[PDB]
Design a protein around this ligand. Structure first.
Ligand SMILES: CCCCCCCC/C=C\CCCCCCCC(=O)O[C@H](COC(=O)CCCCCCCCCCCCCCC)COP(=O)([O-])OCC[N+](C)(C)C
Ligand SMILES: CCCCCCCCOCCOCCOCCOCCO
Ligand SMILES: CCCCCCCCOCCOCCOCCOCCO
Ligand SMILES: CCCCCCCCOCCOCCOCCOCCO
Ligand SMILES: CCCCCCCCOCCOCCOCCOCCO
Lengths: 84, 80
């Protein structure tokens, strides 16, 4: 097919490499952070928003936003798996 | 401040800054190879995403795509 030889296909595979590297570098770190926070459904929103406010206090860039999104995803998984 | 949420927020700022410096130059080269414009940005993003998720999906791939999509939009804006 034409996708994989196009520049768009190539960039998609480069983003796979980068996204897998983000996952390897930080997934377990996020889990450790969340095990220390012990979020539940009762405090997940308040924890996430206060963390976000501190995060962006010193600035915003796309790396910080995607760190927050990945941490938030892991936070939602933590709340789900412990509220079962 | 005194809060643990502040402590966590600063650890995430460290991680986010590391992500930004680790990959933004790679994003830049990718954007220079793509030469995106206002007319083809949606097409390029859609096709990049198709290529990306063909080989699997996890949160790191999803957020990498979202960060690249933001940088694609910023590139088009700055250069035009
Ligand atoms: C921030 C959002 C993070 C979403 C990642 C979800 C994910 O990867 O699940 C994925 C699939 O589940 C999906 O297919 C959901 C896809 C929905 C995409 C929503 C995008 C909205 C953005 C606008 C599972 O991803 P994962 O949990 O990282 O686990 C995969 C890795 N192990 C654990 C299997 C090894
Ligand atoms: C305003 C002109 C003079 C004041 C400069 C003093 C600051 C020099 O040190 C900068 C270190 O700041 C690190 C950032 O810390 C958090 C920033 O959050 C506030 C957003 O501006
Ligand atoms: C020249 C005097 C210094 C003035 C700089 C003020 C910067 C305020 O904005 C900071 C927002 O940026 C977020 C933090 O930057 C992270 C740097 O490392 C990220 C790698 O790209
Ligand atoms: C869909 C999630 C992505 C949203 C990200 C928003 C990021 C906002 O940051 C704006 C400030 O950044 C200034 C320029 O950013 C790119 C510069 O990169 C150079 C490396 O330091
Ligand atoms: C920024 C967090 C986005 C919330 C989506 C997480 C979904 C977790 O539920 C899994 C069941």
């Amino acid at each position: 097919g034409p996708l994989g030889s196009s520049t768009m296909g190539q960039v998609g595979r480069q983003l796979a490499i980068i996204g897998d590297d983000i996952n390897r570098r930080y997934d377990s770190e996020f889990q450790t952070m969340l095990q220390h926070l012990q979020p539940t459904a009762e405090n997940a929103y308040e924890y996430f928003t206060k963390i976000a406010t501190s995060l962006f206090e010193s600035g915003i860039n796309w790396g910080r936003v995607v760190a927050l999104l990945g941490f938030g995803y892991r936070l939602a998984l933590h709340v789900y798996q412990h509220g079962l």
